[PDB]
Amino acid sequence: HSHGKPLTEVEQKAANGVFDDANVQNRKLSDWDGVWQSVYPLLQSGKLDPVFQKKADADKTKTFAEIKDYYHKGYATDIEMIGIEDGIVEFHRNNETTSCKYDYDGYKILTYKSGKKGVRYLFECKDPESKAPKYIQFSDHIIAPRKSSHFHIFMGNDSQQSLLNEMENWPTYYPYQLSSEEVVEEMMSH
Amino acid sequence: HSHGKPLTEVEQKAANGVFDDANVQNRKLSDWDGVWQSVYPLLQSGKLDPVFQKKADADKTKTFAEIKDYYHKGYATDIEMIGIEDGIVEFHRNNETTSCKYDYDGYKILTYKSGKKGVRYLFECKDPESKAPKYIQFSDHIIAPRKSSHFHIFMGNDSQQSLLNEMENWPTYYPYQLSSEEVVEEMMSH
Ligand SMILES: [Zn+2]
Ligand SMILES: [Zn+2]
Ligand SMILES: [Zn+2]
Ligand SMILES: [Zn+2]
Ligand SMILES: [Zn+2]
Ligand SMILES: [Zn+2]
Ligand SMILES: [Zn+2]
Ligand SMILES: [Zn+2]
Ligand SMILES: [Zn+2]
Ligand SMILES: [Zn+2]
Ligand SMILES: [Zn+2]
Ligand SMILES: [Zn+2]
Ligand SMILES: [Zn+2]
Ligand SMILES: [Zn+2]
């Protein structure tokens, strides 16, 4: 070190933050079906350090430590695991789990300060008996139907716009079955 | 084409059906934590045929078709997906799901007609409100604590002994996130 059909040119550009708004498409929650591990505990045990070292050695300005701090802020979350199936997202803290059958509310295209772009896929929990986040957004470098390989998820109870504003913290999830070594390889290979 | 710590000599022999009973150890249900796809639909759509072809070309007697029929009988199941977490096994048929918090009831060492050996890990559902199988058994070429890569599961409502007798049908589950191509590779690489 690819996980289904290779990417087309539009898809590859899209993954690199280059795309036309007209090529963005709606997605179903099932693109994120599966069980997923938070990568934060891997950061916190030093097991992602090889990733930060490769990134440092390839950037002229940033040190290993600056890069590691960037991902520390980015990955931080107490949601250790996320399960998605049958329209339901389940959030695991410790031995506490919450869940909701989320309603899709479309997407939002963002342009970052760098000029690169990304798409958030928006969902809302309207179950009054749920203790899960009212608003969630998926971001995973994909702009049209395709099974996700890993994702960044924004979670909150205030508004969708509050989450659209969040640029520094993006809890990150890889397939649960991967070993720490396999997560590291994935991070170095895409 | 390995998914955590490489196997030791005892482990490798054990995976090949060679081991001393004294080296068998209890395991927790969490060794099978995750979500898992049935490989039967891959068989049924021709997507495992490359596996059967390699196996045929390496066996002096059996044809591609004889091998494929063996796995057809072996893999057959209507349980398309299995999810395991927090001591609960959840079985998915179509849009119907059942589940139970299973009680561990030890293991059973079997010796096959070939003289090779295997270990079944036994669980029982005692939840009167559950519609899940009363008895289940995991078999996955592992005889001591270790996260499973794939497993064979026996399921029934009669007795544990009935399942111990079953040698021809062994519904088989790989990590849900793998593409069909990745399942095929795994089957050709272990
Ligand atoms: Zn690799
Ligand atoms: Zn679940
Ligand atoms: Zn389903
Ligand atoms: Zn949990
Ligand atoms: Zn990413
Ligand atoms: Zn390697
Ligand atoms: Zn990859
Ligand atoms: Zn490979
Ligand atoms: Zn579940
Ligand atoms: Zn748990
Ligand atoms: Zn289901
Ligand atoms: Zn097997
Ligand atoms: Zn290949
Ligand atoms: Zn493998």
Side-chain angles (χ1 to χ4, degrees), chain B residues 15 38 58-59 71-72 117 131 133 139 144 147 165 185 190:
Chain B
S38 175
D59 182 51
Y71 284 105
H72 191 282
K117 298 201 298 182
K131 309 288 289 193
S139 174
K147 302 296 188 173
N165 292 334
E185 180 173 313
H190 305 266

Side-chain angles (χ1 to χ4, degrees), chain A residues 1-4 6-94 96-112 114-167 169-190:
Chain A
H1 221 2
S2 199
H3 329 312
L7 301 175
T8 68
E9 193 177 291
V10 170
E11 289 175 347
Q12 189 54 258
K13 287 185 171 122
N16 293 325
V18 175
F19 57 87
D20 298 330
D21 293 7
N23 285 325
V24 178
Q25 292 163 48
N26 290 121
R27 293 164 75 189
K28 300 166 185 304
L29 186 61
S30 59
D31 279 357
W32 298 279
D33 270 359
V35 180
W36 309 82
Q37 68 184 289
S38 175
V39 297
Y40 190 47
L42 302 179
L43 186 149
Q44 295 178 296
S45 62
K47 291 170 196 249
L48 304 187
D49 282 11
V51 181
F52 311 139
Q53 191 59 58
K54 183 183 171 197
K55 287 175 155 48
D57 298 351
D59 182 51
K60 305 182 169 167
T61 150
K62 296 250 231 169
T63 60
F64 170 91
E66 284 169 341
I67 289 160
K68 185 164 179 185
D69 193 53
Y70 174 81
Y71 284 105
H72 191 282
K73 280 167 196 154
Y75 291 158
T77 180
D78 59 349
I79 307 301
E80 38 177 40
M81 194 175 94
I82 290 171
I84 302 174
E85 69 189 32
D86 302 323
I88 297 161
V89 184
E90 187 169 73
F91 305 87
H92 300 254
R93 286 181 189 81
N94 307 287
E96 177 206 7
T97 78
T98 64
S99 64
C100 185
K101 183 158 189 177
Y102 276 86
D103 297 307
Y104 184 56
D105 199 21
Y107 60 74
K108 298 291 190 71
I109 305 168
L110 299 177
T111 301
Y112 303 128
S114 69
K116 287 187 173 287
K117 298 201 298 182
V119 186
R120 310 267 179 105
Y121 290 83
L122 275 55
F123 295 82
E124 177 174 353
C125 178
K126 302 175 178 156
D127 181 359
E129 291 189 294
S130 172
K131 309 288 289 193
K134 193 178 251 275
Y135 307 106
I136 69 182
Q137 306 181 350
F138 295 87
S139 174
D140 70 350
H141 324 286
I142 293 166
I143 66 166
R146 183 182 186 93
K147 302 296 188 173
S148 189
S149 287
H150 83 260
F151 67 83
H152 311 282
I153 187 171
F154 304 83
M155 298 172 286
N157 290 306
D158 177 12
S159 75
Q160 294 288 8
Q161 186 63 54
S162 303
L163 299 180
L164 295 181
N165 292 334
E166 177 59 62
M167 295 286 143
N169 182 236
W170 10 266
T172 299
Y173 295 84
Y174 278 71
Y176 175 89
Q177 187 271 150
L178 298 188
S179 68
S180 54
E181 294 96 348
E182 284 174 327
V183 172
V184 168
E185 180 173 313
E186 289 305 324
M187 282 175 178
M188 290 179 181
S189 300
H190 305 266

